[PDB]
Design a protein around this nucleic acid. Structure first.
Ligand SMILES: [Mg+2]
Ligand SMILES: [Mg+2]
Ligand SMILES: [Mg+2]
Ligand SMILES: [Mg+2]
Ligand SMILES: [Mg+2]
Ligand SMILES: [Mg+2]
Ligand SMILES: [Mg+2]
Ligand SMILES: [Mg+2]
Ligand SMILES: [Mg+2]
Ligand SMILES: [Mg+2]
Ligand SMILES: [Mg+2]
Ligand SMILES: [Mg+2]
Ligand SMILES: [Mg+2]
Ligand SMILES: [Mg+2]
Ligand SMILES: [Mg+2]
Ligand SMILES: [Mg+2]
Ligand SMILES: [Mg+2]
Ligand SMILES: [Mg+2]
Ligand SMILES: [Mg+2]
Ligand SMILES: [Mg+2]
Ligand SMILES: [Mg+2]
Ligand SMILES: [Mg+2]
Ligand SMILES: [Mg+2]
Ligand SMILES: [Mg+2]
Ligand SMILES: [Mg+2]
Ligand SMILES: [Mg+2]
Ligand SMILES: [Mg+2]
Ligand SMILES: [Mg+2]
Ligand SMILES: [Mg+2]
Ligand SMILES: [Mg+2]
Ligand SMILES: [Mg+2]
Ligand SMILES: [Mg+2]
Ligand SMILES: [Mg+2]
Ligand SMILES: [Mg+2]
Ligand SMILES: [Mg+2]
Lengths: 129, 144, 150, 81
RNA sequence: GCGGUAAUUCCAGCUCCAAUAGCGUAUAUUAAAGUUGUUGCAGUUAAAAAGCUCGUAGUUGAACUUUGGGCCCGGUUGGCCGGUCGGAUUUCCAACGGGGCCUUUCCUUCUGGCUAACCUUGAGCUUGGCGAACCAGGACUUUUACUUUGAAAAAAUUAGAGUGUUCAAAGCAGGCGUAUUGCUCGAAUAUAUUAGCAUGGAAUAAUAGAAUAGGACGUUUGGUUCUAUUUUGUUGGUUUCUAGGACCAUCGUAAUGAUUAAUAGGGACGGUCGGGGGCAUCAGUAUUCAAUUGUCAGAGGUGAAAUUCUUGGAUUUAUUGAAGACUAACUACUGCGAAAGCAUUUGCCAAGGACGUUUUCAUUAAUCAAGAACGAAAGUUAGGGGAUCGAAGAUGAUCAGAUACCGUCGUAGUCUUAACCAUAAACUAUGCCGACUAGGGAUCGGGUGGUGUUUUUUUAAUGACCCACUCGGCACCUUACGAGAAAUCAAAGUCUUUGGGUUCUGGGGGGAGUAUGGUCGCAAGGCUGAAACUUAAAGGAAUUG
RNA sequence: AGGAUAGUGGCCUACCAUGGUUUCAACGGGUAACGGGGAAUAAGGGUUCGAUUCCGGAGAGGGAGCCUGAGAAACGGCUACC
C-alpha cells in the first residue's frame, strides 16, 4: 500500500515534467513534501505551489517551469555521515557544479551544500536536478 | 519494487539470500565443498609426480584424424591412475616405461583440452630432465 | 483493497468541510444526547443511531452537533456494550456460517469464507487487546461464541 | 492540455466529477423539509435515507428507501434545505 | 581452428615482433564479472512468478502538535582604501554561517554563598540590586534510534610532511659555523569500521503521557506516619514546639483534559446484481434396451471394404415403458467465483462483490518464512449405480510389417455417497499492494440528472429504451512520449537521469528433478534434493532463401 | 548452607525448586579454521587471503598427575600408562 507520500509526489512531478505539463496535483501533502518543494523553489526548479486545505491531509498544486529534469527519492532514508555526502553526490548527481542531494538533518531539511556549510549530516531523502 | 527488500532493517534477508544464491555459482561451490582436496586426482596441487605404466595412442576427436601419444601414470601420493599427454614431436621416445614423471595440468581448470578426449594433464619432466630441454637437445637423459 | 477479496471499490461517505454546521438546525446538543440515549436503551448500535438521527431527524453528525462521538456518549452514560460492535457482528456471522456448515457439510465455499471471517475476528481482537478495550486472556472460541453474542 | 488551472476549475466540471475526486470532497446529498397532508409538523428527511421514515404525528409513510435517493410518497410536499 | 602433395598455424632456415636479466608454463585467487547484482542482475517467449487463498518469525506502514515576524551582539568571507614597500588594517555597502532577547513561549529547579553583569552615583571610578558566569550538595528526573564534536582505538604496515640512502626501493636521519671551543631544525599529520564513553542538535522514524480522572498546579486547611540537629545543665529515657520526607482527605486555581476522519481498512444499513456455493425438487428431448405394431430384403459401417445383424423378419415406421447420464439451440472478445471451476425449473440455507450513504470504529493496514483450507482430469479404498462413450483386451481391415491411425465389440473407468491422492501448457507461460503517465468507443453491474421515447389508467409511480455523467469490473481499437533483443506492451512504461513496499524463483547445456537420506501417502506417487562425469556451444526473437 | 580456592561463582557437596537455550538459527556436523594487527586486488562498493618478523592464546610424541617456587600442571623438571 501507500508507504512514502514523498515518493508518489516526486513521481507525479517527474511524469508531469516528462510530459511537458506546467502544473501537477500532489496528494496527500506532507510537511516533508512542503519543505522539499521549498528547497526546490529556493533553487529555482519548480516555481510557486499552493496548499489546498481539505480537512483530511491536504493537496498541493505545483506550478512547473521546464528547469527540472529529475526530482527523485532515496528510499530507505539511509543514515549519512559527512563524507558519505560526497560519496552519494558522486553516485547520484550529474555533475559537481549543479544538482542537490537533499537530506533531513537535526537542523532541518536542506541541501548538501547548506549541510556542508552548517557542518551537520543526517538522513538522505532524495535529489533534484 | 524490484523484488529484493529495501528496508533499513532488512539486511539479514539479503545476507542469507546471497548465501543461497552463491551456492548457485560454480567456483564458490567447488571451493567450499572441497572437491579439489576430496577429488581431482591431485590434492588441489599445481603438479604431481607419478610412475609410468603404459604408453597409449589415443585417437583424436573429430573433425581431426591423429594419434596423440599419451601415457598412463600411477600417482605416488594417491595411487590414482591418470592419463597424461606428452607434448612434442617425438618426445614419447624419452618416457620408455617405469619412469618417474612430473605432471601438470594443461590450463583448462580440470577440463579436457582439445581433440584429446579424457586427458587433463601433461608431462613436464622425465627423471628430472625437462622434456623441453630433451627435445631441444640441451641435456640428455640419465642411464637409469 | 478489501483484504479478503480482490475488490477495489470506493464506496464511502464524503463528509463536509464545515465542522460547525448546518445553520438550519433543530434540536440542541442536550436534546440530541437524550435522543441517542433513548435509542440506545432500546438496543440500537451507534451505526443505527446515527442512521436514524440522520434520516428521521436532521443530524448531519453527532460529532459536530455535539462535541463527542456516539460511542463516547454511550460510554459516559453507561450504555457501552461488552464487546465492540464490528467484532460482535463478525462473531454473529461466523456463528451463522458454522451452524450452516453443520447442517451442510459439503459447503467448502462456506468453509473458506468462515476461515476468512475468523482471520478477521482475530485481527480485530488483536487490535482491541493491544489498545485495552478487550482484556488479555480474551480469546474467541465458537463454542462459547454462540452466546458471546448473548 | 499542458496548461490549466487546477485551483479554479469550472463548476460544470466539478459537478460532473465524482464527489471524492473533486478538489475538495463533499456530499452531493441534502435534506428536505417534508409536509404530510394534515398534520403540518414538518419533518426533516435525508435524501438517501435508508429508512422508511414516517412523521411523529402519524405513521403515514414519508419516504421509501432505494439503492440511492429515497422515493418520497405520492402525497407529500418537500423543500430542499 | 591448422594439417588430406602449392600448410601465412606442424619440423626447420631467414627475417620480423613483444617483454627483457628476465621470460614462459601449471595451480589458486583478484579485477574483468552489472556472469552474486546494497550500490547494481534477471524472471511473458532465452534459466527462473509457488496452482489458489488464508496466515505465524520478519520487512514495510496515511496526515496532524512552534510556524512566522522582529530587535540586538559579535565571528568567516569578501570590498574601495593599499593610508605598508607582490604583504595588511580598520570605519563601509553584501553573502555566509552562531548566540541571546521579545512576540500568549518555564527554555526543570530547592537550600546557600562570589551576589553577578548590581535601583547599586560618592562631586565625573563610589559606602548598599535578582544564586551559577565560580562551586557545593539535593527534589527530581519518558525511553530509544540518528547525526555533529571529542576522547579512545599499541607499534609496525597504509596514505602522507620534511630530508642525500650518489638516484631509487629504503632509512629517520641530518644541517650550519671562524670546523680552533661548537650551534641547531627534527623524528610531523591523517585514516583506523562496528560495540562501548562523553558532548551539541533535535528534523526524520519509533515510544509514553490527563478519559469508569486513584490527573496537574498550591499561597490554603485538618490529619496519619517516618527522620531529626541546635539548645534547654550535663550521659541517657520521656516529651512540646520546631525543621524536613512521604501519604490520605477538602477548599481553592485552572479556555480543566479525547487530533483528523486518509479517492487506507473493518463494520452496519439500503435497493440491487450474479451460469458464486450447498441441499432438496422439476422439466427436456436424445441414447440404449424392452414390449406391442406394420411392411419387407437387405441394413450397417468406409476413401473402398470386411468383421457384425438379417424370412427365427434385421434396418425402418408408429405407440408406450424403464434406466442412467447430460443441460443443446438462446451462448456473446457477456457474467459470478481465491483459483480449480460454475449454464434446465422451483424452494430453502447461509455467503459475497460493486454501488449509494452528511452511518459507525478509528490505523485496526500491505506483503508474507513456518503453518493451514480449497485444489480439473486421471488414479486408489469401499458401497451403490452402471444408459452412453470407452486406457486394457478381442477382432475386421490397411500395411513390407501395424498387437497404430480407420471399423465393430468391449471390461476398468466415466455418475454418485463416504474417504484418499494434491498433481497439470493448474497459462495472462506476466506475483500481491499502491501512485502517476495518451487518446477512442462499446459493453456488464450500481447510482445521479434530463419538461427526453414508449407501455399502462390520454395521464400516473414503475418497468424497458435514448442522451449526458459517474464508481467499479471483463475486455477491445489506435499511437508510441516511453520501454523492449525483438516478437510486442497502457503495462512488459514512470529503470545507468539506475531506490514506492513486499514474498518467491534462476545463474551455460547435459547428467537430473536422476541417486541417496528424510517426510507425507493404502498405493500410484508427491515434497525436499546432490555428486561423479561430460560438453562449446544449447537456447530466444527476427531475416532472406 | 557448607566445603574448596588467592579469591567470585554448581567450582564441588547436601537439601529444595524446575528451570535455561532456540527460525533474531539453539544443539549438532564440517573447516584443506589459532585469532587479530594486517596482505593482494580494488573508480566507488566489495571479493579473497592472513602457518609466517608485532600482540594475544595453545602445545612440547599422546594422555594424565605432581614437586619446587612469587610464579609452572614446566616438559632442554620429575612420576606413571600408551
Ligand atoms: Mg525503512
Ligand atoms: Mg567443433
Ligand atoms: Mg492480505
Ligand atoms: Mg483503491
Ligand atoms: Mg599460431
Ligand atoms: Mg616458423
Ligand atoms: Mg567494478
Ligand atoms: Mg544475467
Ligand atoms: Mg521452451
Ligand atoms: Mg522458460
Ligand atoms: Mg500464476
Ligand atoms: Mg513498524
Ligand atoms: Mg547507542
Ligand atoms: Mg474514510
Ligand atoms: Mg447489504
Ligand atoms: Mg444456485
Ligand atoms: Mg420390423
Ligand atoms: Mg438449456
Ligand atoms: Mg449473464
Ligand atoms: Mg508444478
Ligand atoms: Mg507456472
Ligand atoms: Mg499498477
Ligand atoms: Mg453504467
Ligand atoms: Mg466503464
Ligand atoms: Mg466483469
Ligand atoms: Mg553463472
Ligand atoms: Mg545450470
Ligand atoms: Mg557460596
Ligand atoms: Mg548454590
Ligand atoms: Mg588446524
Ligand atoms: Mg596447517
Ligand atoms: Mg606450556
Ligand atoms: Mg616430532
Ligand atoms: Mg608436561
Ligand atoms: Mg628440546
Amino acid at each position: 500500500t501507500r508507504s512514502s507520500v514523498l515518493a508518489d509526489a516526486l513521481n507525479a512531478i517527474n511524469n508531469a515534467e516528462k510530459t511537458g505539463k506546467r502544473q501537477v496535483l500532489i496528494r496527500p501533502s506532507s510537511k516533508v513534501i512542503i519543505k522539499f518543494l521549498q528547497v526546490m523553489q529556493k533553487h529555482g526548479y519548480i516555481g510557486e505551489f499552493e496548499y489546498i486545505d481539505d480537512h483530511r491531509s491536504g493537496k498541493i498544486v505545483v506550478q512547473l517551469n521546464g528547469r527540472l529534469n529529475k526530482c527523485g527519492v532515496i528510499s530507505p532514508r539511509f543514515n549519512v555521515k559527512i563524507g558519505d555526502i560526497e560519496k552519494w553526490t558522486a553516485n547520484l548527481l550529474p555533475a559537481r557544479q549543479f544538482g542537490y542531494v537533499i537530506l533531513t538533518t537535526s537542523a532541518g531539511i536542506m541541501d548538501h551544500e547548506e549541510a556542508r556549510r552548517k557542518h551537520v549530516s543526517g538522513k538522505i531523502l532524495g535529489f533534484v536536478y | 519494487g524490484k523484488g529484493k527488500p529495501r528496508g533499513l532493517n532488512s539486511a539479514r534477508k539479503l545476507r542469507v539470500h546471497r548465501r543461497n544464491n552463491r551456492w548457485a555459482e560454480n567456483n564458490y561451490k567447488k571451493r567450499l565443498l572441497g572437491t579439489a582436496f576430496k577429488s581431482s586426482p591431485f590434492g588441489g596441487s599445481s603438479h604431481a609426480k607419478g610412475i609410468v605404466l603404459e604408453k597409449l595412442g589415443i585417437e583424436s576427436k573429430q573433425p581431426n584424424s591423429a594419434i596423440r601419444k599419451c601415457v598412463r601414470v600411477q600417482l605416488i601420493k594417491n595411487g590414482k591412475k591418470v592419463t597424461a599427454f606428452v607434448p612434442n614431436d617425438g618426445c614419447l621416445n624419452f618416457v620408455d616405461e617405469n619412469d618417474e614423471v612430473l605432471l601438470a595440468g594443461f590450463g583448462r581448470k580440470g577440463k579436457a583440452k582439445g581433440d584429446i578426449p579424457g586427458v587433463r594433464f601433461k608431462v613436464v619432466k622425465v627423471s628430472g630432465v625437462s622434456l623441453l630441454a630433451l627435445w631441444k637437445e640441451k641435456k640428455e637423459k640419465p642411464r637409469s | 483493497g478489501r483484504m479478503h477479496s480482490a475488490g477495489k471499490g470506493i464506496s464511502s461517505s464524503a463528509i463536509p468541510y464545515s465542522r460547525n454546521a448546518p445553520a438550519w438546525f433543530k434540536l440542541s446538543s442536550e436534546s440530541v444526547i437524550e435522543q441517542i440515549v433513548k435509542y440506545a436503551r432500546k438496543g440500537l448500535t451507534p451505526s443505527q443511531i446515527g442512521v436514524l438521527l440522520r434520516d428521521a431527524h436532521g443530524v448531519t453528525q453527532a460529532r459536530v452537533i455535539t462535541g463527542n462521538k456516539i460511542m463516547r456518549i454511550l460510554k459516559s452514560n453507561g450504555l457501552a456494550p461488552e464487546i465492540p460492535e464490528d467484532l460482535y457482528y463478525l462473531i454473529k456471522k461466523a456463528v451463522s456460517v458454522r451452524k450452516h456448515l453443520e447442517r451442510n457439510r459439503k459447503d467448502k465455499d462456506a468453509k473458506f469464507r468462515l476461515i476468512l471471517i475468523e482471520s478477521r475476528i482475530h485481527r480485530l481482537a488483536r487490535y482491541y487487546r493491544t489498545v485495552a478495550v478487550l482484556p488479555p486472556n480474551w480469546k474467541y472460541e465458537s463454542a462459547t461464541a454462540s452466546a458471546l453474542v448473548n | 492540455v499542458l496548461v490549466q488551472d487546477l485551483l479554479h476549475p469550472t463548476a460544470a466540471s466539478e459537478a460532473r466529477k465524482h464527489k471524492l475526486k473533486t478538489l475538495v470532497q463533499g456530499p452531493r446529498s441534502y435534506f428536505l423539509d417534508v409536509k404530510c397532508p394534515g398534520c403540518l409538523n414538518i419533518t426533516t428527511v435525508f435524501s438517501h435515507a435508508q429508512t422508511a421514515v414516517t412523521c411523529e404525528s402519524c405513521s403515514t409513510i414519508l419516504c421509501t428507501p432505494t439503492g440511492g435517493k429515497a422515493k418520497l410518497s405520492e402525497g407529500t410536499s418537500f423543500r430542499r434545505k
